[PDB]
Design a protein around this ligand. Structure first.
Ligand SMILES: O=C(O)c1occc(=O)c1O
Ligand SMILES: [Mn+2]
Ligand SMILES: [Mn+2]
Length: 180
């Protein structure tokens, strides 16, 4: 299915993680296959982002992909010893150079469309939003893209490749029309 492609095209850590997320909350990766793909994809971006970051070793902190006990434990740890307000939801990363949380968005829609939807869901938070499409289009609050272009090129390419792999297997049209 989709399932095969997912298994073929994402490192096991990411698959295992995706599956547990879905199975925990009663969702079947054999059935909600497009969703399975989307979780993997988002998680991989979240990791790739935090990889890219010789003086500030470990620029980013990863909150996505952890369980919620660890997640809030991390969030709370950061809040106590910096001052930064507590977010209502668990966001994806924390940034130590710019001292702000990041919410990572990946969308098969338009970027400004998805951007708005997320900014509406987290109106009360000073959280940086960065949105990636599968078209090499991004959008970031106050157009502060946080990463150097090299790092952003890498991400855009991974996404475009995922799209073209799916398209290659006649999986893209299903996937595209299945967001939200
Ligand atoms: O953390 C989440 O639950 C989450 O859900 C949907 C889209 C995201 O980007 C995200 O971080
Ligand atoms: Mn998240
Ligand atoms: Mn996210």
């Amino acid at each position: 299915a989709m399932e095969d492609f997912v298994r073929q095209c994402f490192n096991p850590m990411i698959v295992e993680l995706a599956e547990k997320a879905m199975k925990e909350y009663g969702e079947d990766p054999k059935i909600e296959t497009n969703k399975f793909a989307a979780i993997c994809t988002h998680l991989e971006v979240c990791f790739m982002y935090s990889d890219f970051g010789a003086l500030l070793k470990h620029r980013f902190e990863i909150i996505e992909g952890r369980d919620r006990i660890m997640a809030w434990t991390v969030v709370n740890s950061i809040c106590n010893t910096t001052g930064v307000e507590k977010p209502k939801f668990l966001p994806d990363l924390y940034d130590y150079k710019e001292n702000r949380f990041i919410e990572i968005g990946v969308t098969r829609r338009e970027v400004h469309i998805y951007y708005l939807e997320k900014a509406n869901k987290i109106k009360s938070e000073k959280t940086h939003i960065h949105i990636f499409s599968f078209t090499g289009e991004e959008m970031a609050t106050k157009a502060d893209y946080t990463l150097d272009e090299e790092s952003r090129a890498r991400i855009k390419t991974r996404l475009f490749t995922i799209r073209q792999e799916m398209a290659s297997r006649s999986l893209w049209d299903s996937f595209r029309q299945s967001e939200r």
